[PDB]
Design an enzyme around this catalytic site. Sequence first.
Site, PDB file in Angstrom:
ATOM      1  N   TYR A 135      -2.473  14.765   2.863  1.00 26.35           N
ATOM      2  CA  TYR A 135      -2.142  13.268   2.210  1.00 26.35           C
ATOM      3  C   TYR A 135      -3.437  13.523   1.137  1.00 26.35           C
ATOM      4  O   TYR A 135      -4.115  12.951   1.258  1.00 26.35           O
ATOM      5  CB  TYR A 135      -2.388  12.238   3.786  1.00 26.35           C
ATOM      6  CG  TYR A 135      -2.021  11.059   2.943  1.00 26.35           C
ATOM      7  CD1 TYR A 135      -0.591  10.892   2.760  1.00 26.35           C
ATOM      8  CD2 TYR A 135      -2.747   9.845   3.508  1.00 26.35           C
ATOM      9  CE1 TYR A 135      -0.041   9.975   2.771  1.00 26.35           C
ATOM     10  CE2 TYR A 135      -1.930   8.592   2.747  1.00 26.35           C
ATOM     11  CZ  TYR A 135      -0.820   8.619   2.789  1.00 26.35           C
ATOM     12  OH  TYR A 135      -0.254   7.229   2.558  1.00 26.35           O
ATOM     13  N   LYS A 154       4.919   4.756  -2.193  1.00 26.10           N
ATOM     14  CA  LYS A 154       5.375   5.941  -1.519  1.00 26.10           C
ATOM     15  C   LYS A 154       6.779   6.094  -1.489  1.00 26.10           C
ATOM     16  O   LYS A 154       8.071   6.960  -2.176  1.00 26.10           O
ATOM     17  CB  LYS A 154       4.291   6.319  -0.572  1.00 26.10           C
ATOM     18  CG  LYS A 154       2.964   7.095  -1.601  1.00 26.10           C
ATOM     19  CD  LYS A 154       1.864   7.311  -0.348  1.00 26.10           C
ATOM     20  CE  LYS A 154       0.666   8.504  -1.366  1.00 26.10           C
ATOM     21  NZ  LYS A 154      -0.353   6.911  -1.499  1.00 26.10           N
ATOM     22  N   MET A 168       0.707  -1.282  -0.104  1.00 27.85           N
ATOM     23  CA  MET A 168       0.112  -0.353  -0.224  1.00 27.85           C
ATOM     24  C   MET A 168       1.018   1.456   0.003  1.00 27.85           C
ATOM     25  O   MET A 168       1.758   1.069  -0.450  1.00 27.85           O
ATOM     26  CB  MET A 168      -0.670  -0.409   0.513  1.00 27.85           C
ATOM     27  CG  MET A 168      -2.035  -0.870   1.084  1.00 27.85           C
ATOM     28  SD  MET A 168      -3.184  -0.600  -0.206  1.00 27.85           S
ATOM     29  CE  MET A 168      -4.550  -1.492   0.123  1.00 27.85           C
ATOM     30  N   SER A 169       0.107   2.187   0.989  1.00 24.45           N
ATOM     31  CA  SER A 169       1.201   3.499   0.931  1.00 24.45           C
ATOM     32  C   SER A 169       2.959   3.274   0.764  1.00 24.45           C
ATOM     33  O   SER A 169       3.324   4.492   1.299  1.00 24.45           O
ATOM     34  CB  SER A 169       0.284   4.426   1.327  1.00 24.45           C
ATOM     35  OG  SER A 169      -0.124   5.494   0.627  1.00 24.45           O
ATOM     36  N   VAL A 170       3.323   2.362   1.721  1.00 27.12           N
ATOM     37  CA  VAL A 170       4.546   1.850   1.826  1.00 27.12           C
ATOM     38  C   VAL A 170       5.032   2.324   0.840  1.00 27.12           C
ATOM     39  O   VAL A 170       6.593   3.027   0.326  1.00 27.12           O
ATOM     40  CB  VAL A 170       4.811   0.907   3.413  1.00 27.12           C
ATOM     41  CG1 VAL A 170       6.761   0.854   2.382  1.00 27.12           C
ATOM     42  CG2 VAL A 170       4.095   1.250   4.112  1.00 27.12           C
TER      43      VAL A 170
END
Length: 384
Positions: free
Chosen positions: A207, A107, A103-105
Site C-alpha cells: 500500500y 484512491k 482520505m484514501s477513499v
Amino acid sequence: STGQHPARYPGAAAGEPTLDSWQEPPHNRWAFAHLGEMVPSAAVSRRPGHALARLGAIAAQLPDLEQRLEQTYTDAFLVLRGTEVVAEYYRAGFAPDDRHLLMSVSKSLCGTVVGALVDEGRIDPAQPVTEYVPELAGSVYDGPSVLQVLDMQISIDYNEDYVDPASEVQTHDRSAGWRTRRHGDPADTYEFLTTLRGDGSTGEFQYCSANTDVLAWIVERVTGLRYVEALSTYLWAKLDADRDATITVDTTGFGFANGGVSCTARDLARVGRMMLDGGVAPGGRVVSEDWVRRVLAGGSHEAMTDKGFTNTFPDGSYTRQWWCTGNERGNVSGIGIHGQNLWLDPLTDSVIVKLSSWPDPDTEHWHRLQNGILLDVSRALDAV
C-alpha cells in the site's frame, strides 16, 4: 524535469500562477474566479448543534447503533439500499450537506477515472507506466505496468514513519501542500514521485499513496486535462450529485489524487450506486461492466500479505484501488485513514458510507470496531 502538465488556465505558462503572481495579468482573470485554489479560504454561510439520527428500520436490529457510531467518531453515516436512503446519521455540528475529507477513499475515485479511460481504450493497463509518463524513467516506476500501479504491486522504498520528516510519507505531504515545506523538498507532487526508488521487485501488495498520484499523472498525460477536471468529466459530473466535490491542489494545481477529495456522504454513495449498477451512472456509463466485475472479483490473494487486512479478511485482496474483503458477502470497500469507508454490499444491493475522524489514523482497535459496524449493518439489510 517532469515534462508537460495541464495548464491552470488556457494559455497559462508552466506552474502559473503561483501565490506570488496570481494578482498579475494574465493570471488574475482566472485567479479572481478561483482564489480558493491559491489561498486557504472559509465558507461564509448563506444559512443562519445536535446530532441527527434517522437510522430507520435497521435500528430495530441494531439497538445500540448510534452509540457505536459515536464511539467510532462518526461524522456522517448513510445507508443506500437500491436507490433509497434507508438510514442516516450526522454528528452535532455536521450538516447532512456538509462535505467531508475522504482520505484514501479518494484512491477508489481515481481508479474509477483510470477505468473510464481504459473503457475508452485510451489506457492499456498492460503497458508500462513510462509509455504514458516517460519522465518516470529512472524511478521505481520504470518497468512496472499501469495495472501493477492500479493493484499496488510494486516494491517501493517508502518509509511510513510519519513523525520522521525524512520519511517519504511526510515528504509526500510537504510536496503537495498538506504540510509546511522544508528546505530542499521537491517543488511539487510530480517531482516527488520521480525521487522514489525500489529494489525492482513486483507482484506483492504494498500500500503506497504515491501509486495513486502516478495514476492521476497518467490520466493527465492521456487526456490533457488537469486531474481536477478529469475527475469531474469522467466521474463526478455523471453522478447527478447534489454538490461539487473539492480536492486539495499543490502549487502547480495538481489535485492530491491519493487522499485530498471531500464530498457529502449522500454524493459519495452515488459512486457506490454506480459500481452496483454495472458501471453506469445517471449521466452515462462511467466504467465498463467488465471493470466492475474485476473489482468485485478481487485481486490476487497471494499478493496480499498485509496482516492488518488479512487478520480480519483471510481471503482478502486489493485491485484497481479497491480493498476486497473476500468474505462470504463479497464485500468491497474504499478505505481512508481515520475511519473513512465507501462500503459495497452487493448481496443487498446496498452502499454504506461512513465518514469519521478517529483520533488515530490506523489501529487494529479502530478497524475492529468499524468493520464490526459495517458488517452488522450489512447483515441487517438481509431478507429475513
